[model samples]
Target chain A: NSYENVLIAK
Target chain B: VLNPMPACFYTVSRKEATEMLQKNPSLGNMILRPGSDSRNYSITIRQEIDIPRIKHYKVMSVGQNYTIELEKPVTLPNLFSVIDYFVKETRGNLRPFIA
Candidate 1:
C-alpha cells in the first residue's frame, strides 16, 4: 500500500 | 518580492534534458524538471559508465511542503531542501545540472 500513487492519479 | 528558481531547475522536455546531460557531462548529472501538473516536479539523473545510466524520480508538492516519490516517501519543508536531500544522500556524487 503506497500513498505516492494517490497523487499520481491526479 | 520574488524568489528565484534554482540553477538546477529546468523547464525543458525530457528529450532536451537527455541531450544536455549527454552532451555536457561536466555540467552535472541531475536535473529538476516540471512534472505532470503544477503540484508536481521531477528529477532526472545520469550515471556515467560504458553506457550512461539515466533515471527519473517524481516529486509532489503539497501546500508549502514537498515529497519525493520513493518506495518510502521522503518529505521536506521546501523545494530547496528537497534538492539538498538528494545532494547529501548521494554524498555529493550526484550533482545538480546548472545551465
Candidate 2:
C-alpha cells in the first residue's frame, strides 16, 4: 500500500 | 500544546471540514466564459465565508476560527475554478497565519 502524509497543520 | 513563554502565535489547520454545495447552470459552456454568468452563479454555488475573525495580542498570541452554515445548492463546473481560486487564496493567507 502507498501512503502519503497530508499535513493539516504544523 | 506548550508554554512557549507566551507573546507569539500558535496555529493549527484542517481541511475537508464540510460538504460544499454548488448549483448547476443552465448553459454550462456559455456560463464558463461569461464573467457575469460566472459572478451570478458563482455567488450561489461558491463556499462563501459566512464569518471570519482574527486577533493577536502581545501577551497571548493565537488564533481561533470557524465557518458556520454555508448555503446549500448543486455542484457546477465553475466550482472547479472557484475551488482553485479558493485554494490559492487560502495558500496566500496561510503564510501570515503561520508566520
lDDT of 1: 0.74
For residues B1-99, write the lDDT of model 2, one tens digit per residue. 653311111221111111111122221101111122122211112122343322111111113311111232222233343333333534532221111
lDDT of 2: 0.21
The reply for model 1, stretches above 4 Å from the true place, is A1-10, B49-51
Q: Please tell me what DockQ candidate 2 reaches.
A: 0.02
Per-candidate DockQ versus the true complex? 0.06, 0.02
Mind giving the per-residue lDDT tens digits that candidate 2 earns over A1-10?
1111121111
Find the candidate with the highest TM-score and give its number.
Answer: 1
Q: Model 1 over residues B1-99: C-alpha lDDT tens digits?
A: 966666789998666777888888899988888885565888877876345677778888877888888777889987788778887876776788887
Q: Which ten residues in a row have the lowest lDDT in candidate 1 chain B?
A: B47-56
The TM-score obtained by model 2 is 0.18
